[PDB]
Write a protein that binds this DNA or RNA. Structure first.
Ligand SMILES: [Mg+2]
Ligand SMILES: [Mg+2]
Ligand SMILES: [Mg+2]
Ligand SMILES: [Mg+2]
Ligand SMILES: [Mg+2]
Ligand SMILES: [Mg+2]
Ligand SMILES: [Mg+2]
Ligand SMILES: [Mg+2]
Ligand SMILES: [Mg+2]
Ligand SMILES: [Mg+2]
Ligand SMILES: [Mg+2]
Ligand SMILES: [Mg+2]
Ligand SMILES: [Mg+2]
Ligand SMILES: [Mg+2]
Ligand SMILES: [Mg+2]
Ligand SMILES: [Mg+2]
Ligand SMILES: [Mg+2]
Ligand SMILES: [Mg+2]
Ligand SMILES: [Zn+2]
Ligand SMILES: [Zn+2]
Lengths: 87, 25, 97, 120, 129, 81, 217, 206, 96
RNA sequence: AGGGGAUCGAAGAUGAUCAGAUACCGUCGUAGUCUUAACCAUAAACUAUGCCGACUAGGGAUCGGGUGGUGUUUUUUUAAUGACCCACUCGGCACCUUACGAGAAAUCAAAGUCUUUGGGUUCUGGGGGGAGUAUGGUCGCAAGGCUGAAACUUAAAGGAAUUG
């Protein structure tokens, strides 16, 4: 949200649901941001180094949080099978 | 008074003004 | 406001049933709004069962109960029978015991 | 009726919480402990209190009591934990359903076998 | 009976978006629905859509992102007098710096901004933002 | 649910939907060649019928109609398509 | 002395989080009012309204006092707090606090044309509470705040220079009106416009980066 | 982006089938689940144990990704989880909650049960619903042991198992722990059936 | 979708309907029926000059106890008889 | 206007009750209640919720129809039937649970998809009384139905929920 001359104006460009791309606003105290850790050879789990996702309070209320995550992590590489895109 | 009795009240009242007016036709 | 979704009592897809006469006051009341008890009981009673068997021909006989459907009128249902009156919530419960 | 007020019962809790070592099954000494460790304004209330911190003490020795947890118990249990020497791969093979086995066949490999069926 | 086949295809979209979905199937499609669908896509408010061909009137599968708050239809196709395009965008768009009135002119189904640049006007279909 | 392939639905969950609610709609009736070896020729019957279909030359009955699929008669034989 | 009892509280006092925009970014639940006191000290209290309410009891009539308070700077941060105690100053102490907790951001904007510093709104927004709906509309500069004296002060403290308003319903009930105007400017930062379509990497949480420098003992 | 050896071993499958973790629910069957796998006739559905193990891994991945391993709470008011969870928390960072939850533990600093974690493991979202509801007032991701009839409202990543009873719960909890340790961890290498008995995590007697 | 017609040719029905319903306006009806000119002691004009018939002592409604000094007036352009209050302390002493 | 007229029973008459008791309760019982041929056109005629069309969320029952199964049961010699069990699917009467959403609330799968306000169409309401009254027209054998004002008066009347 720039201004007259290129300068950045208006604080705070909010997070978004990785699932719906809706804005995750402040009073949305039901939203969630999962940190999934990257792992290296021989199972070591590398502290402070995550593949991360964010889900809106909406999606979680609707119970879609598990399925939505399933897709997301898997077509990113953390799952193998589980989720199907057909029904 | 009960509405239905008041509806009956004016039914009577009406039938009377129906009479009086008829004396004059 | 509206006090019940069954309104008075239980009729959805009909518009007219047919009055039964109340067993206790003779009041007419729709059949589906009736409040109904199957009063079954032995023709004898409590203590008479021994005296009955004993002063009889036959080995223990058989014994027959009396089967009587009962149709109360709401006010009659409340004044005695099944009624209490229940809280806003407990009202919703259709379970018998 | 001799049901104790809250002030008493509450004081027993708080005491047993932070002075379980010291204290005893005995009232008389539990009595005297109170004078040292805590401030009370009447002889009566102190007795009142101690006779109940005594009572509470007396059946803690025979298993825990809700409300009171002086950490020593939660660790006493955590060591006390252990069991087993059997498990539940003996003997022979795993008995599966038709479809369980198909679940096996359609993902993995090695598995002992055993069929079933069942009805309505 | 269906009066505006457009109205259904718009509504259906909005509902999916609101329910947080990513795709709608709509029925039964028309030339008009497609072109309206096409404008929305030109500006990002949906992704890819696809015409499946029943030997009937058609179905459409739309794939939507999430940048869509509303896509509505204007029920009578009111005539608009190029001077009064202003008044419309005002009544029913969120701000003057984005969002579109999309309408039907003699020179194609176009969003009001294109309509202005080309200098044509006409009747008014719905809108997007 | 929330995200899925409307365009490539699975054959089973497609097979179980209503005949007008599949992706593109089509019938799930079928035709067969039917024969009772008294003769040497086969007649073609619709899986559903309404008319009690008689064979080529012989007054015979082949099937009686029902509320849907015709019941083929007594001892016969058939092959779809 | 402070002594926080919050992962978030400790981190703030510990000078590890400098601005609320951070908190709003990760949508952190605030519980300790002193958070928004060190985090935003330019605030000013406003007692919007005070009404007597009363209750009947098995031995008494509890007439206590309800007070509505709005706090904010005049620079994009509001908070509306409603509390009822039986002393008036008591109701005003607590209300200010509650209103500090409720402190939220405003997305302000230009009526149209870039120029220098957002003076209005980014979109129209509606807020409803009870029967009242308050509808906020972008307006050219020097339009002012077109609103009734209560809502105008709320928009002012919230830091909006020019906006239009329309209201609907029994607006005479101040409690619902401000709560709806409060919802309305709150809604501005959940409105997705094309300038916010750009994907962002998803920032990392203060609760994890200063994991150590938070935490109980 | 896949480990390589973290495939589902034959001994684990054996492990799981013996515990009946794959034995689903009956007529009941929440629509929100493709974790299913063919209806075993007369009631029971069979649970895709691969996707079980595979969720479990993700669970573990997420769990041992909390900087301080203790604000990883394991709830279970279900007795069948109480013994298990206490054990889980023992072996890993994890603070435990067995027995009664007590409401106002995530909201309300004033409470003495007060936690403020970064993640919740939980065993029956029906029985332990207070925790799931509470956390969603305050931004806490929720890993959860679910079944074929469990409410997936506000639980991300469901470990699809069998809270019908017995060992399954314990089995999973053990496996959970057993994996969170094999990660940046105080453990080992390849197969390694692990020292600790799986029957340690179990509901006791009578 | 409830109510009114929407269509592009339904202008007439839309005007008629309004016409029909405007009648429930208390002020509109008074205007169009010419109630003013017809009822109402004045013509419909702002003031009216009349002649004093008797001085009244109207007793006030509850919850007020008083005697409101008034006058019976016969409007000149009219013959219409009307009663009117005489405002302020005394003033009835001025009329006759 | 005929027939019928067992029953229960406006009216009437009576026994009691009561300060009174034109009633409630008890008795007698006219009309009526039933039927034919004509009238009448109103009911809290109610779900106090117009109709057609789309979309939006879960669950177990049930009525009708249909499809599927090396299902159960009927014995004869196995079938064929029939009733039953499981899955699915149209269309019904409803209930359960949630609520994204709606509401002033009670509540509501519509009373949702509405100030981010437009799918098509019908009808009615515009503070309370005055009053469904007056008047005219029209229908009716009548009782009455439909249509249906004003003068004047008045600051409330009303809804839902809360505490007493
Ligand atoms: Mg005469
Ligand atoms: Mg009421
Ligand atoms: Mg009542
Ligand atoms: Mg009826
Ligand atoms: Mg005021
Ligand atoms: Mg009128
Ligand atoms: Mg006079
Ligand atoms: Mg003249
Ligand atoms: Mg008779
Ligand atoms: Mg009499
Ligand atoms: Mg008498
Ligand atoms: Mg009499
Ligand atoms: Mg009527
Ligand atoms: Mg009704
Ligand atoms: Mg349903
Ligand atoms: Mg069959
Ligand atoms: Mg007054
Ligand atoms: Mg009450
Ligand atoms: Zn009765
Ligand atoms: Zn033949």
């Amino acid at each position: 949200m720039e201004n007259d001359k290129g300068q950045l104006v208006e604080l705070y460009v909010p997070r978004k649901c990785s699932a719906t791309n809706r804005i995750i606003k402040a009073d949305d105290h039901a939203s969630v941001q999962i940190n999934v850790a990257k792992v290296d050879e021989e199972g070591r789990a590398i502290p402070g180094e995550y593949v991360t996702y964010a889900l809106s309070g909406y999606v979680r209320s609707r119970g879609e949080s598990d399925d939505s995550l399933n897709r997301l992590a898997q077509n990113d590489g953390l799952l193998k099978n589980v989720w199907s895109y057909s029904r | 008074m009960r509405a239905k009795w008041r509806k009956k009240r004016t039914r009577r009242l009406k039938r009377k003004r129906r009479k009086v007016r008829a004396r004059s036709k | 406001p509206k006090k019940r979704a069954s309104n008075g009592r239980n009729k959805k897809g009909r518009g007219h049933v047919k009055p039964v006469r109340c067993v206790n006051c003779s009041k007419s009341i729709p059949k589906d709004k009736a409040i109904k008890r199957m009063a079954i009981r032995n023709i004898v009673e409590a203590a008479a069962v021994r005296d009955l068997s004993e002063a009889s021909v036959y080995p223990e006989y058989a014994l027959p109960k009396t089967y009587n459907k009962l149709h109360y009128c709401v006010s009659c249902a409340i004044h005695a029978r099944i009624v209490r009156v229940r809280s806003r919530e407990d009202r919703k419960n259709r379970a018998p015991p | 009726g001799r049901v104790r007020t809250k002030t008493v019962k509450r004081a027993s809790k708080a005491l047993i919480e932070r002075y379980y070592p010291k204290l005893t099954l005995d009232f008389q000494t539990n009595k005297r402990l109170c004078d040292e460790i805590a401030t009370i304004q009447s002889k009566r209330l102190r007795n009142k209190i101690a006779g109940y911190t005594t009572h509470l003490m007396k059946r803690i020795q025979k298993g825990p009591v809700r409300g009171i947890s002086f950490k020593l118990q939660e660790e006493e249990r955590e060591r006390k934990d252990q069991y087993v020497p059997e498990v539940s791969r003996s003997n022979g093979v795993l008995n599966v359903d038709n479809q369980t086995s198909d679940l096996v066949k359609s993902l993995g490999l090695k598995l002992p076998l055993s069929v079933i069926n069942v009805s309505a | 009976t269906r009066s505006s086949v457009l109205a259904d295809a718009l509504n259906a979209i909005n509902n999916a978006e609101k329910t947080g979905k990513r795709q709608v199937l709509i029925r039964p499609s028309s030339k008009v629905i497609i072109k309206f669908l096409q404008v929305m896509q030109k500006h990002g408010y949906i992704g890819e859509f696809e015409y499946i061909d029943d030997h009937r009137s058609g179905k459409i599968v739309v794939q939507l992102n999430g940048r869509l708050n509303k896509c509505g239809v204007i029920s009578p196709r009111f005539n608009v007098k190029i001077g009064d395009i202003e008044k419309w965008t005002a009544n029913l768009l969120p701000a003057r710096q984005f969002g579109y009135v999309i309408l039907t002119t003699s020179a194609g189904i176009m969003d009001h901004e294109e309509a202005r640049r080309k200098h044509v006007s006409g009747k008014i279909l719905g809108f997007v933002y | 649910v929330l995200v899925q392939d409307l365009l490539h639905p699975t054959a089973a969950s497609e097979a179980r939907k209503h005949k007008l609610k599949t992706l593109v709609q089509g019938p799930r009736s079928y035709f067969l060649d039917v024969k009772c070896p008294g003769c040497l020729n086969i007649t073609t019957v619709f899986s559903h019928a309404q008319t009690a279909v008689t064979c080529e030359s012989c007054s015979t009955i082949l099937c009686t109609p029902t509320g849907g699929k015709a019941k083929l008669s007594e001892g016969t034989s058939f092959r779809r398509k | 002395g402070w002594v926080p009892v919050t992962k978030l509280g400790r981190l703030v006092k510990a000078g590890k989080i400098t601005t609320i925009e951070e908190i709003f970014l990760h949508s952190l639940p605030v519980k300790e009012f002193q958070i928004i006191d060190t985090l935003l000290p330019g605030l000013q209290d406003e007692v919007m309204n005070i009404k007597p309410v009363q209750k009947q009891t098995r031995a008494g009539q509890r007439t206590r006092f309800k007070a509505v308070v709005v706090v904010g700077d005049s620079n994009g941060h509001v908070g509306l707090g409603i509390k009822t105690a039986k002393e008036v100053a008591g109701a005003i102490r607590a209300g200010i606090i509650i209103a500090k907790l409720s402190v939220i951001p405003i997305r302000r904007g230009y009526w149209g044309t870039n120029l220098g510093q957002p003076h209005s709104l980014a979109t129209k927004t509606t807020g409803k509470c009870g029967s009242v709906t308050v509808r906020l509309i972008p307006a050219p500069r020097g339009s002012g705040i077109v609103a009734s004296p209560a809502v105008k002060k709320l928009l002012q403290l919230a830091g909006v220079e020019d906006v239009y308003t329309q209201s609907n319903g029994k607006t005479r009930t101040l409690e619902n009106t401000l709560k709806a105007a409060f919802v309305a400017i709150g809604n501005t930062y959940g409105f997705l416009t094309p300038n916010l379509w750009a994907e962002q990497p998803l920032p990392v949480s203060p609760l994890d980066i200063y994991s150590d420098e938070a935490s109980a003992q | 982006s896949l480990p390589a050896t973290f495939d589902l071993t034959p001994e684990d499958a054996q492990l799981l089938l013996a515990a009946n973790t794959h034995l689903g629910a009956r007529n009941v069957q929440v629509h929100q689940e493709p974790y299913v796998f063919n209806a075993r006739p007369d009631g029971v559905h069979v649970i895709n144990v691969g996707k079980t193990w595979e969720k479990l891994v993700l669970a573990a991945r997420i769990i041992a990704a909390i900087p301080n391993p203790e604000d990883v709470v394991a709830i279970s008011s279900r007795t069948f989880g109480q013994r298990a969870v206490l054990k889980f928390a023992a072996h890993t960072g994890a603070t435990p909650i067995a027995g009664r939850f007590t409401p106002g533990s995530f909201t309300n600093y004033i409470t003495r049960s007060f936690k403020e974690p970064r993640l919740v493991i939980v065993t029956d979202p029906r029985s332990d619903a207070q925790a799931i509801k509470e956390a969603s007032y305050v931004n806490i991701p929720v890993i959860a042991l679910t079944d074929l009839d469990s409410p997936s409202e506000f639980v991300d990543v469901a470990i699809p198992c069998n809270n019908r009873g017995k060992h399954s719960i314990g089995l999973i909890w053990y496996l959970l722990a057993r994996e969170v340790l094999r990660l940046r961890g105080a453990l080992v290498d390849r197969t390694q059936p692990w020292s600790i008995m799986p029957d340690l995590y179990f509901y006791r007697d009578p | 979708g409830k109510g009114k017609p929407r269509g592009l040719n339904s202008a007439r029905k839309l005007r008629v309907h309004r016409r029909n319903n405007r009648w429930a306006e208390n002020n509109y009806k008074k205007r169009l029926l010419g109630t003013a000119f017809k009822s109402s002691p004045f013509g419909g004009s702002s003031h009216a000059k009349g002649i004093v018939l008797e001085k009244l002592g109207i007793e006030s409604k509850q919850p007020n106890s008083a005697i409101r000094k008034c006058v019976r007036v016969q409007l000149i352009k009219n013959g219409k008889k009307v009663t009117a209050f005489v405002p302020n302390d005394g003033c009835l002493n001025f009329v006759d």
